[PDB]
Amino acid sequence: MEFVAKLFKFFKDLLGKFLGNN
């Protein structure tokens, strides 16, 4: 299944902003 491939990846963009986008 490829349901999280986009879901889990979407949230990663929200966290990445705090995790470090440099």
From Swiss-Prot:
Keywords: Cytolysis, Virulence. The keyword Protein transport does not apply. It holds the Pfam family PSMalpha. InterPro entries: PSM_alpha, PSM_alpha_peptides. GO terms for biological process: killing of cells of another organism. Belongs to the phenol-soluble modulin alpha peptides family. Peptide which can recruit, activate and subsequently lyse neutrophils, thus eliminating the main cellular defense against infection. This is Phenol-soluble modulin alpha 3 peptide. The gene is psmA3.
